[model samples]
Target chain A: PCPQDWIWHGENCYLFSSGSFNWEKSQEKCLSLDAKLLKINSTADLDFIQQAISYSSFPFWMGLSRRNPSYPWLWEDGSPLMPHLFRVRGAVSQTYPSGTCAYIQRGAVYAENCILAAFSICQKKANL
Target chain B: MPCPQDWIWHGENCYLFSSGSFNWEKSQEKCLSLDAKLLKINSTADLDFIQQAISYSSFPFWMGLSRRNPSYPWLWEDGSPLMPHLFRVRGAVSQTYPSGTCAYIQRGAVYAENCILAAFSICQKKANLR
Candidate 1:
């Protein structure tokens, strides 16, 4: 929709961007372009990931995570998203109780959130 | 170096090509473009591979293999490559004893040399991933 550069893989197209941004801004950015976040299904999807973007802050707010503060996490594709694997790297505690959006950044399994902005990656797929 | 078109990764860039060609021709073509065959390493390197190029060939001649008749397998990156893991899909006897240059094609470790030309995928990663 944004006519942005998107890489085509199989039946889907992916667009990757870096740098830190809040969930609201990220959502807006993607919405403005008619794109949401990324949705990785299996190894086939994994190949699309080009690189690991690094930022200076905490969890990189991804295009994923809990949309409903009191409900189950839902994918933009309208699928009940269940990750076959879940790994959390570099955070003070292993808890994301607030249930903000999902994101991935660098660091081991325990880094402090200095409230510093961190970079993140986003993924989105086609409808048909 | 080829002023044409190339994709850039982190420290290295990768170029993926399809369509089957003899080993000799592949080498010569890469040389012309200042690029070579694709190479794979540990799992980290595995992530770069994009799609599986289906070909009807017995084996997909990769960029790495034995240089000498009796020498061990050496990687193009100059490392004595020992596969951390190896699996054969759809083929007979499960062997390449003569061990001609190494390559990967589709099939379950056993297929016939129908001599039919098939399409394949090739990867040329940066020098550092080795």
Candidate 2:
């Protein structure tokens, strides 16, 4: 079962946060709650987040980032972001950026500096 | 987390029930004032979830469904055509005049009624960011 106020979808329950934490702090916050920052594994996963967030007009910190501009983008789960699975809009082929993290706004993902505060979304496997 | 005061959270939407009666258009307007819309049934599962709550009420609710004319296909508030495969609305949905037809839930089935009639309403919206 999911905890109070956490949204359940598939086998997981999610908790979304306000735009008050930077990428690292947000991750730590989720950890404290026995969860992790949001990680997108497929188009359907991204679509679910879009549905959950359509009411909010603010951007949210997600779990994708790169070590440097030269390295591949990696999710919080250590899976490298596949270019074919999704498009980052202002990212990827169009000068998307470095030491940077990803955030979602209006269903689109974009890269931004890691230190800036933004909303967060946490994920965890639901208890059976 | 508990959804807005007086609102119930189910799936991805938050629903608010109205104690007062209002016309279909007015119900839609009231939902808008609360940053919501008249309940739009997106799937059978969604309908089932709502049924549990509505069962406790004595009145039915206005849904965000309508058509320009009987000849025109029924459309949700977002303009998406209602799929024929989804569960059917029980009562008559078409009329001779173009006065407009709206859908509401009553007796566990959907019914088409004149949009001008006042009925208790259900308002739906997505959860705000926490």
Candidate 3:
């Protein structure tokens, strides 16, 4: 059986956390549970995740963030972030803090403070 | 070798373009009766071919995309993600308030349409037999 409360898609199990936590805390919690902050590599992952949190009011934190401002936006896994199917607009660094993190709300990505309380999405390789 | 009767072979799949109208699910049922599934496009080449195949159509032709739960993922009938990469949609009111889950291909663009509305459909199967 798969993990409880986790949605299975393709080769991974996803968890959209309900509790409100800061970006840092959310990533930490996911790591504690043997998962990582959601890292979207393909259009398939983008569509799956957007639909997963469509009904939720709270913005869900993704694994993307920039240490400073716009020069380099990297994922939690230390890989360079690249735009794919879903464009991450409305997330300009100038609109928010220089060291801002990203959250998905209403099917679009937005930049915000790392300390702001938000929901989270976690992903892990399925045992199957 | 030719396809069976009305079916047409393109790329690596055999397709059936229905002239009769039916709801999304009903059309899917019809396709299943013929041992095929609603078309699932895999590449840009496949998308172009499908668009050309349906270019003469005046009405939208149902492709394989649905959202059982709006909050969940949108998947094709064959359990693949309905990615936005190859989507060439037009005339959507807004992405936030899409009219329906079922998608149709028209003029090389995909559009959202109510599943209950009767429309033509395309079915496909692996072209393994003569």
- State the TM-score of the second chain for every model: 0.45, 0.90, 0.83
lDDT of 1 at B89: 22
Residue A52 C-alpha lDDT in model 3: 57
Q: In angstroms, give how far residue A52 of model 2 lies from its true place.
A: 1.5
Candidate 1 docking DockQ: 0.06
Error of 1 at B4 (Å): 13
Q: For model 2, how does the per-residue alpha-carbon lDDT over A1-128 read when each residue is reduced to its tens digit?
A: 57776776667888887447878898899899999888888877887888777666788888888755677788888888866666654444433333678888888888777777798899999764
RMSD values for the candidates in order, in angstroms, are 9.3, 7.9, 18.0
lDDT accuracy of residue B50 in candidate 1:
27
Stretches > 4 Å off in candidate 2? A89-98, B1-130
Can you rank all candidates by lDDT, best first?
A: 2, 3, 1
- How high is the DockQ of candidate 3? 0.01
lDDT of 3 by residue, B45-125 (tens): 678667655656677788888764346566788788866787654443244433356778876678765677778899988
In terms of docking quality, model 1 is incorrect
Best by lDDT: 2
Worst 10 residues of 2 chain A by lDDT: A89-98
Against the correct fold, how does model 2 do in TM-score? Answer: 0.52
CA-lDDT, candidates in order = 0.43, 0.78, 0.74
lDDT of 1 by residue, A29-108 (tens): 66766666666565444433423223223454544455334554455566765565344344433334344455554422
